Amino acid sequence: GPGSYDAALPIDELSALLRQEMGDDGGGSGGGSMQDIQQLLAKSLTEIKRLKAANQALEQARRE
Amino acid sequence: GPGSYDAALPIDELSALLRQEMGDDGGGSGGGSMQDIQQLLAKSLTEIKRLKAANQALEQARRE
């Protein structure tokens, strides 16, 4: 199976992991530009905010 | 300007946003070397997995 910790794994693995958490259609590229990092690092930040918004909303909505 | 759906903002802004989402006192420069992205793009991915596990744990507790 996989390793016991996520310790210093390469850029291809952490890119595939955040894209798999968002259910991608086999995305990513070898581009490495300022635009490539901005798109990836905005996408992971957007997914944090999506889960926090949903968590905060459902905790009061299901309480009835 | 539009009142919703921020996109294509500079790398310093999205990096200060993911750092303060993880509880830092704001942020600074977004960097651009391979060592910078292997840190910040993994930290933001760890915060997705954290909040998914938190949301899942309270959902299965309050379905009763």
Side-chain angles (χ1 to χ4, degrees):
Chain A
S4 56
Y5 299 99
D6 303 331
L9 47 71
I11 197 77
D12 295 335
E13 294 299 325
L14 66 99
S15 171
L17 261 55
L18 75 91
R19 287 187 289 106
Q20 178 163 228
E21 287 298 347
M22 286 179 278
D24 77 325
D25 192 21
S29 71
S33 66
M34 187 100 293
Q35 298 189 123
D36 191 15
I37 181 175
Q38 280 179 268
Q39 285 167 97
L40 288 169
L41 198 61
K43 274 279 282 181
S44 62
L45 181 276
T46 299
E47 184 66 359
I48 297 163
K49 289 179 179 291
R50 192 182 73 87
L51 266 293
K52 287 182 182 184
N55 185 318
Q56 183 171 107
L58 74 87
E59 277 271 78
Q60 62 170 64
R62 299 182 82 211
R63 207 175 181 184
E64 295 187 11
Chain B
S4 61
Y5 301 107
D6 300 333
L9 41 65
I11 193 163
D12 300 347
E13 184 72 359
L14 64 93
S15 300
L17 261 59
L18 71 88
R19 286 189 67 172
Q20 80 195 253
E21 279 293 346
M22 290 184 281
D24 292 0
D25 188 16
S29 178
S33 301
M34 190 102 289
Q35 184 57 225
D36 308 330
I37 186 181
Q38 281 191 257
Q39 290 179 26
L40 274 69
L41 196 64
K43 287 172 64 65
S44 56
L45 178 275
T46 300
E47 185 73 356
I48 297 165
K49 289 178 178 288
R50 183 193 184 193
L51 271 291
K52 285 189 177 194
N55 188 321
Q56 181 176 9
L58 62 87
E59 273 192 321
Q60 68 82 53
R62 295 183 172 124
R63 62 71 58 196
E64 296 293 288

